[PDB]
From a paper:
CCs are quaternary structures comprising two or more α-helices supercoiled around each other with cyclic (Cn) or dihedral (Dn) symmetry. Here, we describe variants with all combinations of the aliphatic residues, Ile, Leu and Val, at a and d to give four classes of peptide: the ββ class, with a and d = Ile or Val; Lβ, a = Leu and d = Ile or Val; βL, a = Ile or Val and d = Leu; and LL, a = d = Leu. Peptides are named systematically appending the one-letter code for the amino acids at the a and d sites to “CC-Type2-“; e.g., CC-Hept becomes CC-Type2-LI. In summary, solution-phase data and X-ray crystal structures demonstrate conclusively that different classes of Type-2 coiled-coil (CC) peptides—i.e., based on abcdefg repeats with predominantly hydrophobic residues at a, d, e and g—adopt a range of distinct states.
To explore this switch between assembling open α-helical barrels and collapsed CCs, we tested if examples of some of the latter could be opened by introducing polar residues into the hydrophobic repeats of βL and LL sequences. Specifically, we mutated the centremost Leu at d (position 17) to Glu to give CC-Type2-IL-Sg-L17E and CC-Type2-LL-L17E. However, unlike the parents, they had accessible thermal unfolding transitions. Both transitions were pH dependent with stabilities increasing sharply below pH 6–7. Neither of the L17E peptides bound DPH, but both sequestered its cationic derivative trimethyl-ammonium DPH (TMA-DPH) with μM affinities suggesting that the barrel states are accessible. Surprisingly, the X-ray crystal structure of CC-Type2-LL-L17E overlaid almost perfectly with that for the parent CC-Type2-LL; i.e., all six Glu-17 side chains are completely buried within the core of the assembly. The experimental and computational data correlated well: For CC-Type2-LL-L17E, at pH 3–6 experimentally the peptide was highly thermally stable, and simulations showed a mixed population of singly and doubly charged states; from pH 6–7 the thermal stability of the peptide decreased, and the main charge states were (Glu-17)62- and (Glu-17)63-; and above pH 8, both the α-helicity and the thermal stability decreased dramatically, and more than half of the Glu residues were deprotonated. Thus, CC-Type2-LL-L17E appears to tolerate two buried charged Glu residues, but above this number severely destabilises the structure. The macroscopic pKa for the transition from two to three buried charges was calculated as 6.8, which is > 2 pH units above free Glu and considered highly perturbed.
Numbering used by the authors:
A (entry chain A), B (entry chain B), C (entry chain C), D (entry chain D), E (entry chain E), F (entry chain F): 1 to 30
């Protein structure tokens, strides 16, 4: 239902945020 | 109640944050 | 209730942060 | 209760985040 | 119990993020 | 619960963002 769906969407977004943070860290190192 | 809605908004905002981190990473590369 | 509203406020803050970091990216890129 | 106190802490942190985002926007605008 | 603790952790981390946005703002000014 | 879990994960992500942004701040000063 609605809450389960929203929690799954938040979990996807957290994964995207972590991936993006790694891209920034890489760019900073470069 | 409104918990699921709040989590949907939070997931959407976190996606926007992730995209900004990706844009910063690319900006450091020109 | 109050929990959901505070999470909506947290989402609004991360949305604002995303926007400001996107502007920072545009300024760094030049 | 503990939840109410925690929401209070999050509200304080939101207010600090908001002022720092204002400062970042001020640094960017100029 | 665990939700109030998670919210307190989230407040702490938002304050760290505010500190970092201030540092960005200052760095933009040299 | 699942919610406390996800919010702890978000706090960790905001702490990592704060670290990266402080490194960006130093990079913006050369």
């Amino acid at each position: 239902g609605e809450l389960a769906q929203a929690l799954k969407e938040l979990a996807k977004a957290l994964k995207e945020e972590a991936w993006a943070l790694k891209e920034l860290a890489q760019a900073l190192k470069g």
